[PDB]
Design a protein around this ligand. Structure first.
Ligand SMILES: [Hg+2]
Ligand SMILES: [Hg+2]
Ligand SMILES: [Zn+2]
Length: 263
């Protein structure tokens, strides 16, 4: 049913190392003629190390060879120069060395420091990005004669302590957007997740059409999440369990603690 590739690593430096090679392998296996490949970036300290890795040893591939076109998988409705911005983090560690025409962040230019972003601001931003995606990437229907969503070559994902991924939180509308009518969803963090601001994020539908999905996660507090995704019959499962329905190649790069129970 679900046979994902799994690799357990002892340290973050090792997990990020596996992350770097994986991406590079996808780039090379795909071929120079398929470049630039579309990739949806994830935020967080784990992916950050992977991006630093790419910056230090593979700029000839990414910069000179222009192998990748960078998009954001989810973003915080804050200014692009905010420390809470996922794009800001990606630019700092890597994107600053990438040709400007290969970098596509969410247009959050309307968000000002004076006022918090609202649900409508988020939906407006998600809508504009979705159209841009449907314009730049190849489309595919979700189910026969189903709605069409853009197809990413690669989608990077993190995992949360509460069981979410990207900005698709428990009991949210985004969680049910699996039919393909919505390409880019919106979401607001639960009580225990930070920062407290509205988010825009790829819907579960879009994510499941990606050619390659790579989840980078660590920590003993996220162990039930991995277990709940891989488990054969999970009723009280985590939101991330929807990753079972992904149509492309699915990989899990984990650390020892989060994969302890792993059989
Ligand atoms: Hg690498
Ligand atoms: Hg997946
Ligand atoms: Zn640099």
């Amino acid at each position: 049913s679900f046979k994902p590739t799994i690799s357990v690593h002892a340290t973050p430096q090792e997990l990020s190392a596996a992350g770097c090679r994986k991406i590079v392998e996808i780039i090379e296996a795909s071929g120079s003629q398929q470049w630039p490949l579309s990739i949806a970036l994830a935020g967080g300290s784990t992916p950050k190390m992977t991006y630093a890795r790419l910056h230090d040893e593979h700029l000839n591939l990414l910069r000179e060879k222009r192998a990748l076109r960078f998009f954001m998988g989810d973003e915080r409705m804050v200014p692009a120069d905010s420390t809470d911005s996922n794009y800001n983090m990606a630019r700092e560690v890597l994107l600053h060395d990438i040709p400007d025409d290969l970098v596509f962040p969410f247009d959050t230019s309307a968000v000002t420091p004076s006022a918090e972003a609202t649900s409508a601001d988020a939906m407006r931003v998600a809508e504009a990005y979705g159209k841009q995606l449907a314009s730049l990437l190849p489309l595919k229907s979700v189910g026969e004669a189903g709605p069409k969503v853009p197809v990413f070559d690669v989608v990077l994902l993190g995992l949360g302590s509460d069981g979410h991924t990207a900005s698709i939180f428990p009991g949210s509308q985004a969680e049910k957007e699996t039919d393909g009518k919505v390409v880019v969803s919106v979401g607001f963090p639960s009580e225990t997740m930070k920062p407290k601001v509205w988010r825009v994020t790829l819907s579960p539908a879009t994510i499941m059409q990606a050619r390659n999905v790579i989840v980078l996660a660590t920590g003993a507090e996220k162990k039930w999440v991995v277990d709940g995704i891989l488990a054969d019959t999970a009723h009280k499962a985590p939101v991330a369990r929807f990753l079972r329905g992904c149509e492309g190649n699915v990989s899990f790069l984990l650390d020892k603690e989060i994969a302890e129970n792993l059989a």
